[PDB]
Amino acid sequence: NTFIFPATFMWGTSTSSYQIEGGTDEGGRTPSIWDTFCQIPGKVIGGDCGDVACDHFHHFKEDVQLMKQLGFLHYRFSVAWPRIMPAAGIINEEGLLFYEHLLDEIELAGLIPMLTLYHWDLPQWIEDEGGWTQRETIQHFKTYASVIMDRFGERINWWNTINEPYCASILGYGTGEHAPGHENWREAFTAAHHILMCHGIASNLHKEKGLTGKIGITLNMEHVDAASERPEDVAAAIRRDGFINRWFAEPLFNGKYPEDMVEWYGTYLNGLDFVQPGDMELIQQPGDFLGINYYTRSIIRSTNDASLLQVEQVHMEEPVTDMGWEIHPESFYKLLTRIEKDFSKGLPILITENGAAMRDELVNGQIEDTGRHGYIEEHLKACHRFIEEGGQLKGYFVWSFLDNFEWAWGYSKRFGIVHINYETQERTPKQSALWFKQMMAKNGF
Numbered sequence: 001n002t003f004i005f006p007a008t009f010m011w012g013t014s015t016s017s018y019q020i021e022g023g024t025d026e027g028g029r030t031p032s033i034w035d036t037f038c039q040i041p042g043k044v045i046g047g048d049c050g051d052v053a054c055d056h057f058h059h060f061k062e063d064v065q066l067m068k069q070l071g072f073l074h075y076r077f078s079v080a081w082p083r084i085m086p087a088a089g090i091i092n093e094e095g096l097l098f099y100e101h102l103l104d105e106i107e108l109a110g111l112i113p114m115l116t117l118y119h120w121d122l123p124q125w126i127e128d129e130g131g132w133t134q135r136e137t138i139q140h141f142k143t144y145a146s147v148i149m150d151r152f153g154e155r156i157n158w159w160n161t162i163n164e165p166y167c168a169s170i171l172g173y174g175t176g177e178h179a180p181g182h183e184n185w186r187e188a189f190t191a192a193h194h195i196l197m198c199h200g201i202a203s204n205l206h207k208e209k210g211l212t213g214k215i216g217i218t219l220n221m222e223h224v225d226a227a228s229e230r231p232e233d234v235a236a237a238i239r240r241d242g243f244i245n246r247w248f249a250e251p252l253f254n255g256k257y258p259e260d261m262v263e264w265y266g267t268y269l270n271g272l273d274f275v276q277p278g279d280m281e282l283i284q285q286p287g288d289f290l291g292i293n294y295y296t297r298s299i300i301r302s303t304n305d306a307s308l309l310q311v312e313q314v315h316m317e318e319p320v321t322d323m324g325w326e327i328h329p330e331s332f333y334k335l336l337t338r339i340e341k342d343f344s345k346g347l348p349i350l351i352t353e354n355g356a357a358m359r360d361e362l363v364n365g366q367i368e369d370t371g372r373h374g375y376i377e378e379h380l381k382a383c384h385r386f387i388e389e390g391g392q393l394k395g396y397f398v399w400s401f402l403d404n405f406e407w408a409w410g411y412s413k414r415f416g417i418v419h420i421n422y423e424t425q426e427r428t429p430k431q432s433a434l435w436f437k438q439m440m441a442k443n444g445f
């Protein structure tokens with residue numbers, strides 16, 4: 001009973017610029033939308049902000065070194081837009097420089113990087129103009145994406161255009177739970193449209209520059225189950241499915257929005273007026289791979305409330321993380337299968353984010369995060385069953401190399417395999433991290 005992964009399975013770890021970097025007002029960086037957002041009372045637990053965070057801006061050389069010794073060959077990070085374009089058309093050399101020195105270390109250590117272009121930290125000066133609700137913002141992204149592709153490109157093996165368009169649009173302008181924090185469904189869908197286009201934008205700039213590195217977008221997807229066999233619950237699950245999965249996957253591989261969902265939104269879509277000629281075509285560019293982020297399945301029931309979807313999420317209390325998320329690895333194998341079947345039916349699948357947050361305690365310099373550990377392994381068994389069965393999964397990046405700013409949850413939630421002591425900023429690998437190093441060694445378990 002062993003699980004040996006492919007010979008070329010890419011193993012790595014992922015992080016995000018605002019979530020770890022710190023150095024918010026250093027090197028010319030100007031405020032991002034989350035710096036404004038974290039300041040609104042009640043938006044983020046304990047009022048935590050991305051101020052300092054893990055301070056990766058100063059400890060990066062050690063962190064990359066710490067990765068190598070940990071056994072990792074791939075590292076996915078993101079570039080802080082506010083660090084590159086602190087203002088309308090200016091290009092901050094000091095910022096392009098930080099990532100350069102970072103890349104030096106990546107290569108010096110002998111690792112293969114994956115640069116994520118957009119990971120929710122939009123420049124506040126851009127949100128001032130209307131942010132993602134304005135087509136013009138797509139032009140500002142083109143500017144940003146070109147600079148980074150020209151300044152590099154000859155050193156990037158994998159390009160990750162947008163990380164989870166669903167969060168940045170639905171949660172950022174619709175539910176108000178992420179930054180900038182608007183509660184307007186007409187904006188959320190307009191924003192989802194514009195961010196989805198920025199994926200095409202970067203994919204075009206990619207072909208024109210003739211870069212050789214791979215390119216793909218990242219969607220957070222979730223397997224959905226109906227709460228009961230009642231017709232309304234089944235309909236409820238369908239809606240939730242199109243809401244998170246189909247509304248972003250459909251345009252990516254089919255060049256269209258889910259018809260059923262388009263109807264359910266109706267008025268809020270304003271008749272798809274935000275869609276201009278050539279937009280859908282621009283958006284339908286799968287690229288060389290499809291990045292996926294998964295954590296747990298959702299159990300859905302119907303309600304007749306005042307919410308957009310009118311769906312309720314049954315809160316499974318059985319085996320859950322410190323975040324209250326159910327631990328159902330079966331659903332991961334199930335979601336991966338459904339992703340191949342539709343949409344990627346062939347195209348390489350890369351798991352750009354998978355992990356869990358548990359309560360961590362130090363026992364004489366070591367953290368026995370048996371819980372987190374069991375979570376990675378079990379979910380890896382699902383990826384293994386997908387493979388072996390014909391699954392095109394070519395990689396897996398454990399989410400959070402280090403504990404970091406967990407958005408609205410702040411620092412209270414730790415996804416790291418490496419412990420961060422925020423009073424001293426010192427790093428300390430968790431048992432789960434040691435387990436991963438051994439695992440990648442034998443390339444299995």
Ligand SMILES: *[C@H]1O[C@H](CO)[C@@H](O)[C@H](O)[C@H]1F
Binds near residue numbers: 163164293399406
């Ligand atoms: C994947 O989800 C985790 C857990 O919420 C976030 O910290 C990452 O930014 C996201 F890409």
